[PDB]
Structure 1
Amino acid sequence: TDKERFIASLMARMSNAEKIGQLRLVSVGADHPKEALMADIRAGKVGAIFNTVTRPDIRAMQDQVRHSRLKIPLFHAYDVAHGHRTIFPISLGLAASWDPEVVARSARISALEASADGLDMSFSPMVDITRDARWGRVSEGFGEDTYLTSLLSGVMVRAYQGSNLAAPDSIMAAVKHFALYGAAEGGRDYNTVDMSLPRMFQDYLPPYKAAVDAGAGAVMVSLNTINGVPATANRWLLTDLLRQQWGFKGLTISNHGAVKELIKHGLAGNERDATRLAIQAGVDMNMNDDLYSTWLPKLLAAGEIDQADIDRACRDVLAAKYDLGLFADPYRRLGKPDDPPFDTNAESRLHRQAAREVAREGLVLLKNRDGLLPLKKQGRIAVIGPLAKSQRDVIGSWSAAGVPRQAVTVYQGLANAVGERATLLYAKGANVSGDQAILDYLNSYNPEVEVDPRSAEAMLEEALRTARDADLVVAVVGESQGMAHEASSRTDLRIPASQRRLLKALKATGKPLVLVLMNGRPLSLGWEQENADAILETWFSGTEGGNAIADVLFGEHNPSGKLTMSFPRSVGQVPVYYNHLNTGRPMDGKYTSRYFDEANGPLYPFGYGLSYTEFSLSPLRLSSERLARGATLEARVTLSNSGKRAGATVVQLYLQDPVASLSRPVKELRGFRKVMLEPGESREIVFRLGEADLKFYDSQLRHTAEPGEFKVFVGLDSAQTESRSFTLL
């Protein structure tokens, strides 16, 4: 009522010109030069800013608000995806921690730094489910699993927003991309999404819903068609589902140029009609293309739009500014005037300890033949590969205000660890790619890839001479961050050919070979799994990446990360995911659902990851054989560290509904516990399962649990499990 009073009196004052100006979301660019933008803010024609990210710059913009009749403050947004200035691992690496508190910590520090620079909103978290490793943006999400992505979706929102959206160290979450953006056909960015409603409700929508139920202040709408209707023009998605069914009360934001793109989708013949479709579907705020400002007045005057369409959009912008505390104090995130100036990028405003501890948790040990890892800080260590000394790659895609020169490379991380106790020998070995067309693509906007002008053969000969002079080879190989970016979809999932040629030459020297992988998507690693002695998955591990990688390689931290996305044997197996249907003819002979020209199944399954120690699970026990409606059941198992080193693992609870009105998955994740144990230590793990855990969407979207058998599986990954059954009454 108090908020409603302030907001209703303010909107009673406003002209349509002022209401429509609140819907304009812009950035300083060629589209909107700084001084023209300043004039537009003075004239009341701007609602919010993105990509202006420092206190002085945001202050100068907020200072123009004084010259408007109503003095409605701006909010300031940015893409703080996995860090603002202190860069954490990419989301796919954070997910691999299997630890909500580690992810929450990355989010809280991101919000602290962003809010310290004056930012009120992040276009995050990205909660799109990804089953297609070809898509460039899988790096930005939490992998293939609905339960895990849904849990981390809520965690990110609560950690960004705190208990109070007005707090100077809180930012608003704009959850993206609503919806289904990750299921693009062919894994080609922006491409067609087509799926049944039961799959959509069961597998793809719950993460957006968790963000809404966690109190997300905003929702960013996606660029893709859903079943033939672009999200930006999809009333069924933005009004019926998001508002009426889920009760979302916040702000909807279109993606960059999305209203105008309704023309190229063939939903609209002109910008006037595109604008009508977007506002009536339920898009409040319009990013960069300015069609709302250009066309809403004419649409309203012609009776094509209703006043209520303008009023609803405007109300959502004002309610967001109110909740962010910006009517109370527009400078609340910008300090007091006469606070002394600072270097935005000062070393003292970073959080290196938080970045290092988080980065350690996401590293996944994929292979370790004969205890080669951990390494001893001694002897001669060859560090070879195009990513060994790469500052720009270790902070990954969507590195926000991250500064490459402030990042710790793998080489530098190893140098910091050994000091004088061991000798590092360096050789680039190869360029990230040997294909000139792929280098032209990676270098097309900014210099992202250091191209060594020497021949491939000369770099190899140097690498082989370096390996020969060492006790063992740490090969730092994989993708540059520009390969797992928006619009950077891949037809091949292997390590690039220039680097595989290097690895083959390194193998033939007979030296022990440790692979340190940098990559923003699942890679095809058949040759590496056969021929490398050890493999460490490091994703893009952030500002402190190299230090956290050295901490695991030398045994300071025992690798605890587990995969949250299945690793295909090749691109021709796509899609592969752990929660698939059985079919009528599952492969364990010939007449089964399989390929004939390659081994079947993923190379590494969902939830896979090794340790320097060994863990054991006692038999799974259920607290009863039968479960009454309204009752809870307990699944009990004892986890023991039966090896020589302290270490964490992740105990995973899976569920199967083997008889149902729909064909249900062979298994679905329904719980986990990350557990840190000393040698010989045990922990009794108790999972609680109720009827809520057993429901699914039928063909008419009835969300019900049916009577009958459920199988419960517990294990340290999605493959290596045992099951016990109970009956729901």
Structure 2
Amino acid sequence: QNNQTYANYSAQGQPDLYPETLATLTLSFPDCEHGPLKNNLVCDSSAGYVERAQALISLFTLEELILNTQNSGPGVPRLGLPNYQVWNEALHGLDRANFATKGGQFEWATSFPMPILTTAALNRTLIHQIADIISTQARAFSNSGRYGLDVYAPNVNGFRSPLWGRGQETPGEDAFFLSSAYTYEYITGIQGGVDPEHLKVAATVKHFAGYDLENWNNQSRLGFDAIITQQDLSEYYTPQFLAAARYAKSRSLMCAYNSVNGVPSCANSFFLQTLLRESWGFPEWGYVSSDCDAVYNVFNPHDYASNQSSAAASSLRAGTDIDCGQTYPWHLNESFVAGEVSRGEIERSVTRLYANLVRLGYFDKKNQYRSLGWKDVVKTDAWNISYEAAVEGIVLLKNDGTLPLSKKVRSIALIGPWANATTQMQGNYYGPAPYLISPLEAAKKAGYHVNFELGTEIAGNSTTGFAKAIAAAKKSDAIIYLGGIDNTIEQEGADRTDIAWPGNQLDLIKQLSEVGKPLVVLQMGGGQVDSSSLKSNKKVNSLVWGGYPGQSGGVALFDILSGKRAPAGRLVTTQYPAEYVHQFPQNDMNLRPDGKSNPGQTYIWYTGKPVYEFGSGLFYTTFKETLALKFNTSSILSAPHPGYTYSEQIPVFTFEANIKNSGKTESPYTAMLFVRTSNAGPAPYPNKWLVGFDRLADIKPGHSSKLSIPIPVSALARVDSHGNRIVYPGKYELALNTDESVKLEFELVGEEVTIENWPLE
């Protein structure tokens, strides 16, 4: 929009936003005791939140309403109503806050691992706690004028194509179960429960819907025209948004840049009204924000509206309330003149925003969250949940016993482009951290003598650094190589063009494997890279996926490597062979194989051979898993369901297994539980799909713990060609983990039961 020369938004991965959209405002609170609003109902803390917002909006001029439909809302100075910023980031810690540059207070916020790594922990309680800490820190900043009260998080699109520049931001490739679980825990942590009266921070689940590429084949996200079947929309592209609106009761949602089936998401009433509000029960006074600036893109480049004013009117009437951008505040005035919008329509959207702000305590100085301050940031940071999340999520992919490092390992050759990682560890959407502990610093802190060499860049073809790296390996007891990908490889606005290791890293690794020393390789980054040559090289003793491990990443990594902590992470995406992305267009949105070039996408449908499967992870001990059936689903749905708000949450039954530590090392345990059928519902039948996961506390040698994974009705439903969610009679089989240590067949009997009627059109 703010391009100085010709810009082709069909190709260009980044928008040209106005400085107004991008501005860092100084925030404050209305003075409800003494300011111009003191006798208006909005300042009456005993009045209802809607009535309060309505009384406030009645005081605005039309121009003031229109100007306050943008993310950088100017407020209304004459009313003592401050500017308020809707655009705040919280993906894995606060970002876009007005951070102080000196003086101690507000110089930083906790930098958690990227969500891709946190999710690998398979710990729901962990995700909820991170979100609770993020929202506490958000409130502390808000109370000093340095951050807003709603956040553009979580990013929950499925990580479908493995080259997506932003898959690092997500809970992985399993949109239905794993992503939806993250969605619920995160949103309830941000908001302070399930739609509490006193909202803590408003979540903004994103990006709705069909967005999962930046610019593959030079087709920018900004003008991307996704073609998606109703079945896939229901089954893969939206179930996490159902979970956000229905279960978590997200107060906000962000519509995506792309069109789906010809209609830009922010101008898509089928999405924003029919699905979101009518089908999934998104709060009546919840509000939708556009992406920055998806409303502009309705016009340029989608050409769904012929100008900015018509783009603004179309979006507003479709159900987009707030524009992250300048299209609303600078062109809805023309819409009103042209008769395309009413003042009622504009008032509804601003009232929606302000109704949330009332719920958030924006007008109530005695609100329970208005007293959190800098010491709350300091205290919650000191809990070290960022460290805990990385330690829990790190994934052991290959091991022969080299890990954990024996006490006979005194010196290490620490080599590679991640070896001294600081800012690399933070991924993207990060603010300043209290500290950044590199693997190098942590290795020295752990007692090892460290021979450190860069070896090679992430993406070089210079071999300049190889000789010193090999020399160091020769001098040391063990070799720890840290490399892989980072945000120079995968980022917003620019997808990867391949899913191989970048540069000449694999060459250096191969040469290190020929020195005759123990070799541990750490593959870092959010997307996966093809480690087939490492899997197959006997001289690569260990392989760890370490993601983006946050502020304490170095210590998390080395605590695992030294065995101070024992790993239990499992992969949350498939590690595909490199050729996969060349086999078929990555913007084919169809999940299922098509008997042509599309081999099936994600672990659910892929017909090829992953290098490492979704769900892969090893332990420092061995576990002996043992089991500890006909179900009529119409009957199961006939019973009361105390403890469950929605009937589709009721367990059909609970899978129970005994998990015995049959090895010598105390270790936590993780499990993914998958189900298969070859006769229930429509063909083709998937490989399998995830229906449950859990993580169990440390199990000592010789000890056992019960794994209990309920199998909810919703998890057994399949999706028909119309998008309806139906539980079908037939034969099913559960399998515990990628190693399928336990299997359990069961039958569903009786009639088909409808769980969701997918609305037409």
For normalisation by structure 1, the TM-score amounts to 0.82
Q: Take 1:226 and 1:210, find their aligned partners in 2: how far apart are those partners?
A: 20
Name the count of aligned residue pairs: 649
Which one of the candidate residues 176, 183, 206 is aligned to 1:153?
A: 183
Partner letter of residue 310 of structure 1?
Answer: I
Contact 2:403 2:562 in 1 (8 A): no
Conserved in 1, the CA contact under 8 Å of 2:402 and 2:541? no
Matches within 5 A, 1:494-509: 494-509=500-515
User: CA distance change for structure 1 residues 12 and 647 in 2, over 3 Å: closer, same or farther?
Assistant: same
User: 1:217 corresponds to which residue?
Assistant: 251
SS at match of 1:117: helix
2:122 aligned residue: 98
1:471/1:287 CA distance change after superposition, 3 Å: same
2:527 pairs, out of 521, 524, 534, with 521
- Of 390-399 and 604-613, the range deviating more from structure 2: 390-399
Alignment partner, residue 24 of structure 2: none
Tell me the amino acid that sits aligned with residue 393 of structure 2.
Answer: G
Match of 1:726 among 741, 744, 747: 747
Deviations 1:79-119 (A, max 9, x none): 11112321111111011000101111221111122221113
Shift of 1:268: 2.5
* Root-mean-square deviation (Å): 3.2
Match of 2:711 among 689, 696, 699: 689
Residue 351 (1) aligns with residue 386 (2): no
Shift in Å, 1:343:
11
Distance 2:220 2:549 in 1: 24
CA contact (8 A) 2:613 2:738 kept: yes
1:610 matched to which residue of 2? 618
Tell whether 2:553 aligns with 1:545.
yes
Which 4+ residue blocks in structure 1 deviate beyond 4 angstroms? 164-169, 183-189, 330-336, 346-349, 573-577, 579-585, 718-721
- Give the aligned partner of residue 285 of structure 1: 322
State the alpha-carbon separation in 1 of the partners of residues 541 and 502 from structure 2. Answer: 20
Tell me what 1:79 maps to. 89
Which residue does the alignment assign to 1:658?
678
**Which residue, out of 171, 181, 187, partners 1:142?**
171
Report the Cα distance in structure 2 between the residues aligned to 1:326 and 1:207, rounded to whole angstroms.
29
Partner of residue 133, structure 2:
109
1:319 is aligned to 2:347: no
Give 1:301's aligned residue: 337
Q: CA deviation at 1:164?
A: 8.6
Aligned residue identity for 1:425:
N
3-state secondary structure, aligned to 2:173 = coil
Deviation at 1:359, TM superposition (A): 1.2
Mapped contact 1:165–1:325 kept (Cα < 8 A): no
Structure-2 change in CA distance of 1:472 and 1:115 (3 Å):
same
Partner of 2:241: 208
Report how far residue 235 of structure 1 moved: 1.9
Cα distance between partner residues in 2 of 1:392 and 1:542: 9
Q: Show the counterpart of 1:361.
A: 392
> Map of 1:35-54 to 2, 5 A cutoff?
46=74
Secondary structure of the structure 2 residue equivalent to 1:458: coil
CA deviations 1:528-585 (Å, max 9, x no partner) are 21222101111010000001101100001111000111110214257899x9768899
CA contact (8 A) 2:269 2:318 kept: yes
Q: Is the 8 A contact 1:362 1:561 kept in 2?
A: yes
* Shift of residue 163, structure 1, vs aligned partner: 3.6
CA deviation profile, 1:45-89 (whole Å, cap 9, x unmatched): 625xxxxxxxxxxxxxxxxx6x42362663554211112321111
Matches within 5 A, 1:387-466: 387-402=418-433, 406-418=435-447, 422-434=448-460, 456-466=462-472
| Distance (Å, rounded) in 1 between the aligned partners of 2:297 and 2:668 | 48
Query: 2:630 & 2:421 partners in 1: Cα distance?
Result: 56
**1:592 Cα offset (Å):** 13
Structure 1 pair 646–255 and aligned structure 2 pair: CA distance change class (3 A): same
**Range 120-129 or range 271-280, more displaced:** 271-280
TM-aligned CA deviation for residue 174 of structure 1: 0.9
What amino acid sits opposite 2:318 in the alignment? A
Cα offset, 1:256, TM superposition: 1.1
Pairing 1:647–2:677 present: no
1:162 to 167, 182, 192: 192
**In 2: Cα distance, 1:234 partner to 1:478 partner:** 39
Deviation at 1:392, TM superposition (A): 1.1
CA distance in 1, matches of 2:452, 2:445: 15
Asked if the contact 1:662–1:698 (Cα under 8 Å) also holds between the matched residues in 2, the reply is no
The residue that corresponds to 1:41 in the other structure is none
Please tell me whether residue 175 in structure 1 is matched to residue 205 in structure 2. Answer: yes
Q: Which residue of 2 aligns with 1:269?
A: 306
By how many angstroms is 1:407 displaced? 0.6
Change over 3 Å in CA distance of 1:169–1:408 after alignment to 2 = farther
Q: 2:412 is aligned with what amino acid?
A: I
Q: How far, CA to CA, are the matches of 1:125 and 1:251 in structure 2?
A: 16
Question: Match for residue 88 of structure 1?
Answer: 112
Partner SS state of residue 68, structure 1: helix
Listed one character per residue, the Cα deviations across residues 428-467 of structure 1 (whole Å, up to 9, x for unaligned) are: 11122216xxxxxxxxxxxxxxxxxxxx333111111111
1:517–1:77 distance in 2 versus 1, CA, 3 Å: same
Shift of 1:478: 0.9
Query: Matches of 1:592 and 1:210 in 2, distance apart?
Result: 25
Partner of 1:376, secondary structure, is: coil
| % identity of equivalent residues | 25
8 Å contact kept, 2:199–2:359: no
Cα deviation for residue 518 of structure 1 reads 1.4
Conservation of the 8 A alpha-carbon contact between 2:459 and 2:504: yes
State how far apart, in whole Å, the 2-side matches of 1:434 and 1:374 are: 30
Q: Quote the Cα distance in structure 1 between the aligned partners of 2:455 and 2:304.
A: 51
TM-score (structure 2 length as normaliser): 0.79
| DSSP 3-state at the match of 1:497 | coil
1:675 match: 696
Kindly state the Cα deviation for residue 378 of structure 1 after the two structures are TM-superposed: 4.0
Deviation at 1:687, TM superposition (A): 3.5
Matched, 1:567 2:575: yes
Q: 1:233 maps to what in 2?
A: 267
CA-CA distance at 1:204 after TM superposition: 1.8
Asked whether the 8 Å contact 1:73–1:327 carries over to 2, the reply is no
- SS in structure 1 of the partner of residue 236 of structure 2: helix
Counterpart residue identity of residue 173, structure 2: E
- The match for 2:641 is none
Q: Quick check: 1:636–1:687 contact (8 Å CA) kept in 2?
A: yes
Q: What is the aligned partner in structure 1 of residue 70 from structure 2? A: 24
- What SS does the aligned partner of 1:611 have? coil
Is this contact kept in 2: 1:94–1:358, CA < 8 A? yes
1 CA distance for matches of 2:195 and 2:65? 23
Which structure 1 residue ranges, 5 or more long, are not aligned? 27-44, 48-64, 436-455, 586-590, 594-598
Give the deviation of 1:128 after TM superposition. 0.5
CA positional deviation for 1:678 = 1.1
**Contact 2:121–2:393 under 8 Å retained in 1:** yes
Cα distance in 1, alignment partners of residues 55 and 703 from structure 2 = 64
